[PDB]
Amino acid sequence: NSTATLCLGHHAVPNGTIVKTITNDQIEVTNATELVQSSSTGGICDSPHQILDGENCTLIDALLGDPQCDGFQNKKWDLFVERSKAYSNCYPYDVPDYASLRSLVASSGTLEFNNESFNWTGVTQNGTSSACKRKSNNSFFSRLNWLTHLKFKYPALNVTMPNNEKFDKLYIWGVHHPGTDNDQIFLYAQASGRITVSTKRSQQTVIPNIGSRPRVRNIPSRISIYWTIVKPGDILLINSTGNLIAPRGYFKIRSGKSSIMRSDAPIGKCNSECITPNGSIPNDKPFQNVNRITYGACPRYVKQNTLKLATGMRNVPEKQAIAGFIENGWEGMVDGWYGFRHQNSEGIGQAADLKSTQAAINQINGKLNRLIGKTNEKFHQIEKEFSEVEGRIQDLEKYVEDTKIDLWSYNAELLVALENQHTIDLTDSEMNKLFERTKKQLRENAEDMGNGCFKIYHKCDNACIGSIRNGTYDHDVYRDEALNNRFQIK
C-alpha cells in the first residue's frame, strides 16, 4: 500500500483478421473490410440505365430491319444487350467493318429512323424473298428497298437526297451479289456494274460480284452492307445500273453515353449502377474481379480476388498483477479501443478513454469515406473478347487492356499496403500519445514500470485515478508524499 498502479492499454478481440502492410506480409488486426467485389447477383438490373435486350436480334439485325426485330423500331438505349443465341433470319448479308458499324450505332444509342421519298423512277421497288418472311409473307429488311428492273429495263440511277437538317444523317445501304448470271439478268435486265454513293466529302464505289457462295438459309447470293454519314449542307448521291439495295431514309445519329454488351444474364426488375456481362454488381467497393467488361459507375477491374483494408488496430492476445499495452492487449476492454486499468486502495478497475478511441475511429472512417461508394462512371469503351482471329488490331486492343489491368492491379496492391501501414501507425500512435500524456501529468509522482504502467508513489483512490483519466490531476498536491516514498532508503 501507500502506492497505486495505473496501466494504459488497448482492446483485443478473439476473432482478428489478417491483412498486409508495408512492414508485414501478414499481420492480424481487430477488423478489416473487403475492397474487391467478387460476386454478382447474376442478373442485369433494368434500372437506372435504359436497357434494350436484343433477344434473338443483334443490333445490326435490328438496324437493317430483320422482321423478327420489328419490335425494336425507333427504340433508344443506354445499354443494348446482345445475346449469344441471336441469329439472322432474313437475306444473308455481310458488313465490311461490321465491328465499326456496330460500335458507332451502339454509341449513338438510337434506332430512330426517318423515311425519305427517293426518286426511283423507272425501276420496280420493294423486292421480297422467301428467305425473309414477315407474317408468313415473302418480305425484306424493313429499312432497305430492293430495286429490280421495270419492264425489262433498269435505267441508270442518279438520285440525290440533300441534308437540309441541322443534324447528321446515317444512311445504310447495300449491294446485291447474285448467285448466277441468270439471276443478274432476271433481276436487273443487264450485266452487273459498279455502284457509287457519294457526298461532297466522300465517295464509296462497290462492285457487285456474281457467284455462288455456300447456301445460307438456302440462299447462295449475298448482300454487302455499307454506310454513309451525311452532314448538314451536304448531299447524298446514289449512282447505279443495278444490284442496289437502296436506303428508305436515314437513322438519326446522336452522341452520348450509350454502349452495347454481350451477355446471357437475365434482365431483372432491380436497381444497380454497375453492369457487367455476369450481371449487375454492387459498387460500394473500389475494385472488382468479376469482369473487365463494365458499364456505368463501376469498381475498377483488378486481378486480385481479395484485398483487405484494416479497420482496426493490431490484434494482440492477453498475456495470462495488472499490465499495460507492452506486448499485451485487453480482451475485456469492450467499451473503448484504448483505456486505463488501475489498482489502488479501493480495488482494480478499468475505464475506456473516449478521446483516443474516437480519434482512431474518425481517421479510419475518413479513409473508408475515400474508398467506399466513390466509383466513377465509364460508358462505351473497346471490345475485350473476340470470336474471330484478326491479328494486328486485336493484338493491340488486347495489349491495351492487359496493360491497364496490370497497372490498376499494382495501384490497388500498393494502396492497400500503404493504407494498412498507416492504420497500424495511427492506432499505435494513439496508444503512445495516451501513455505520454499520462506520464506528463504525473510529473515526479510516478515511475514507468516498463510494461505500459506507472507506479504512482502515493495513495491514489478512485477519485484520484479519475482525476488522472480526466486530465485534472494536480501533481503538486501529492508531490511531497510521492517524493518521500520514491527517494526513501529501504
Next chain:
Amino acid sequence: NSTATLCLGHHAVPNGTIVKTITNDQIEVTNATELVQSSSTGGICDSPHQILDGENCTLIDALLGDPQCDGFQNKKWDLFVERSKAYSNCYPYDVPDYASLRSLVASSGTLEFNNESFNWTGVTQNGTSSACKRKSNNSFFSRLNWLTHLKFKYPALNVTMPNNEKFDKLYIWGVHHPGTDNDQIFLYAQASGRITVSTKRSQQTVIPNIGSRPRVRNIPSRISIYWTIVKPGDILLINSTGNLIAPRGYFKIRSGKSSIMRSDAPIGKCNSECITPNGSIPNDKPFQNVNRITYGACPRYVKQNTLKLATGMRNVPEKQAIAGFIENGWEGMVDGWYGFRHQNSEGIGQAADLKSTQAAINQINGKLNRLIGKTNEKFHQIEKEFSEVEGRIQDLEKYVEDTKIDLWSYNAELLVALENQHTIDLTDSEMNKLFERTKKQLRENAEDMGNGCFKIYHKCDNACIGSIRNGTYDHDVYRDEALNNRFQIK
C-alpha cells in the same frame, strides 16, 4: 523566483492554406504551392520550336501544292499548326487514309521536294483547270502533273524512276475520276482502265470510276490521292492508259521530333517550351489541366484542376504565462520556424533556432526541386479529337488516352497526399527533436511541464538561457541548486 521557464515552439501565420494528406482530407499549413497548371497566355510562342502556321492551308494542301499554299514550298517545322478556317481551293480531291498521310508528313517535318524528269513521251503534260487558279490563270496542284491525250492518242505508259540516293523518297500521285464518259474520252481518248504503281516491294492498283459526285467548287469529278515510299536501290514503276495524275518528283522523308496540331491560337513573339491548342503554357509545374494535346517539354495532363503541395508545417493558432508547442503555435515568431521562449530574472524573451528551421526548409526545397521545372518532352503522339465518326480505331485511340489520363491523375493524387504527409511529418519531427535535445541538455535540472516547456529549477539568467540555446549549457554547474529546489519539502 529561483526558477526559470523555457518553452519550445514553432511559428504560425495568420493566412494559412488547406492541403490534403494521407491522414487528413483537409489540414491547414503555413504555405503551399500549386502543382497543376490551369491557365495559358492564349498564344502559341514562336520560340524555341520552329512553328509553321498553315493559315488557310492544311498540311495536305501544302503538300499537293494548292496555289494559295505556294509560300510553303520546301519549308520545315517542329510543329505545323492547322487552323479551323483552312480550306482547299484547287481540284476537289480525297485521300484514302488521309489521317495516315497527314501523320507521316507531319512527323517527317519537311516539305522538301526534288523535281525529277519523268519520261512522259506521247501524252500532253501540265493540264490545268479553272477550279485551281494561280495568279488568275487556270492551273493545277504544283507537285502534280495532269497528263492528257496527245493528238487523240494516249499510249500505254510504263515509266520508271530508280532511287539511286541513300535516302527514302516519298511519291504523291493521283487518279482522276471524271464526271462523265464524255470527259473520259475528251481527256484520255479511250475508256478508263486501271493504274498500277509498283516497286520491288509493293504494288498499288487503282481503278478510275467515272461518275458525277456532288459539285464542289462547281466540279463533279474527283482526284483520289495515293502515296508510295521508295527505298534506296528500289525503283518506282508507273503503268497507266489514262486518268493518271503524275508526280513531278519526290518529297524527302525525314525522321525526328516534328508534329502537327489543330489550333486557332495566334502565334506570338515569345519563348515557351510547352505548346497546347489553347496556347503555350508555363512548364514549371509537374501537372496541367489545360489540354490533353501537348507538344514539347510539358507538364502531364491530369483531371484535377488544383493540387496543393504543402511548403510549410501545420498552421496552429496561438492560445490566448508563456507556453510551448503543445496545441499552440507562435504568430510572433517571424525570424524562424522553430525557437525558444523563456522567462527568467531578466524578463521574457524569444529566439529562433536556426538549425531546426534550416533543416525543415532544406527538405522542403529538396522536394520542390524534384517536382518543379522537371517536365519531360513529348512530340508526335496520337490524335485526341475527331471531326468524324469512325468506330473501332477511334474507340481504341480514345480509350488509350482516357486510360493514360486516369492513371496519371491517380499518380498525381497519391503523390501529393504522400508528399504532404511527409512534410507534416518532417516538420513535426524537427519540433520534437528540438524539444528532446533540450530535455537531454537539462538532465536533472528541469522538469517537463507538459505544455512544451521546461521548469528549470535554478536561477537561469539571459546568458544561461543562451547557453541552452547554443548547446553549451553545463548541467553540472547548476545541479546542486536544481536538486535542492526540486526535491524540497513544501
Next chain:
Amino acid sequence: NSTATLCLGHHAVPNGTIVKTITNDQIEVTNATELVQSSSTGGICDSPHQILDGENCTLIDALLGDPQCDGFQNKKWDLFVERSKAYSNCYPYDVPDYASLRSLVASSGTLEFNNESFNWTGVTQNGTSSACKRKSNNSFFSRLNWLTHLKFKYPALNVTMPNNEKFDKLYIWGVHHPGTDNDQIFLYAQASGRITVSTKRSQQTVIPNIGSRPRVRNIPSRISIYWTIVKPGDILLINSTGNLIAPRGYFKIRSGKSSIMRSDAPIGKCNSECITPNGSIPNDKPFQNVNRITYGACPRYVKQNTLKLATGMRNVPEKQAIAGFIENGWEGMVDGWYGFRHQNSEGIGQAADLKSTQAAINQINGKLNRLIGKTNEKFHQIEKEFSEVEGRIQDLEKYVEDTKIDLWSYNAELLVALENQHTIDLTDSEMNKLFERTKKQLRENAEDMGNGCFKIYHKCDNACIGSIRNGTYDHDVYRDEALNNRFQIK
C-alpha cells in the same frame, strides 16, 4: 569509479552505398542491391521455351513452303526467331496485311499442315518456276498449287471443301498477277477475271492485275497471298476462271502462348526464362532496361538504368570515452547490427544485441522476398519496332508502349524511394527501441547522457552489465546505492 557507462549503438561499414529515399536524394546506407537488370549474356537460351530459329526463313516463307524452308514443315514453337538476314527465294509475292498473318500464325505456334484432295478437274496442276528451285529442279511453294490450262482450256472452277472436323482450318491461297497479256493467255488460255473464295460467313473477291512490276529475282509478275479461316460445320468454296494459286490443304490453328521475335542473337544451350532480342536475361530483378521487347517470365521494362534498394541502415562514420549512436556509428561492431558498449570496473566491452539485429534483417529479407524472383510471364504482345512508315496504326502502337513504359518507370521510382525510406525508418526504429528498453530497465539508477549512453550510478560489473543486456537486471537491488550517488551534494 562508483559508476559505469552503458552505450547503445549500431554498426557502420567502410564501403557504404548511396540510395534515394523520400527524405533524401542521396543517403549512404551500409548495403544495397540493384533492381534494374541491365546486361544480357547476348545469347537466346534454348531452354525452357521451345525455340524455332528461322535462319534464312521468315515465318511467312516457312508457311508458304519456300524450298529453303522445307525443314520447318509441321514444326511448333513457343518462340519463332526471325533473323535480319532472312530472304525469300521463291516466286515473288506480297501479303496484303502481312503483319496480321504473321501475327496470327506466330500466336498459333504451329506449322502443322494437313493435305486435302481438292477436285481440280479440267486444269493442269503443279506449275513450277526457275525462280523457285528445289534440289536444282524448277519447283514452287510446297503448300500451294499453281493451276494452269489443260489442252488450252481453263474451265470455270467451283470447288468445295467442307470442314467436318471439330477444329478450325486456316487456308492460305493466292492470286497470280502475270507480267503481260501473253503470259495470261499462255498460262490460263483466256483473259483474267476475278477470284472469289467464300464460306457461309465470309467472302473475299480478288482481281488479278496484269502488268510488269520491277523484276525481283528476274520475275516481273507477282503472287498476292490471302487467307481464310473455316469453322467446323462451314465450307470453303473456291470460284475462279484463272490466276488461282490454290491451297493443297489447311494449317491447324491453335491457341496458346506462342510468339515471334526479331533477333540476331545466337541460340545457346542454356536455360533462362526471359528472352529479349539482345539475348536471354536473368529474371531475379523486378525491372530491366535491356529491351522493351520480351518473352517469358521477365522483369518489367523501365527507362532507369539503375535503381538501388537499401538492404541496410544509414551508414554513419565513427567520431574520433565510449559513445553511443547519437551522430555516431561503430565500425568495430562486426557481429551484429546493434549492440552495447560499456565501461565499468573491469574494462571497456562490446556485445551485439541479437534480437534487434535479427528484427531488422528479417524485415529487409521480407521486402527482398517480394521483389526478387517474382516476375510475371507475358507472351505474344504488340510489335514495338517497325521497318516501314505507316502512320495512324503505328502511331497508336508506339504511343501505347511509350505510355506503358513511362507509367512503369514512375511506379519503379516511387516504389524504391518508399521502400528505402521504410528501411531507413525501420532500422532507425530498432535502434530507438533498444535504447528505450534499456532506459526502462534502469529506472532511477541511471541518467541519459545525451550521446546514446547511460551513466549508471552504481558499481556495475561484467555480470551486472550482462544482466541489463539479457533483460534480467533488477533495479531494486541497486536503487539505494544509485539514489545516494545521484542525489548527493558535491
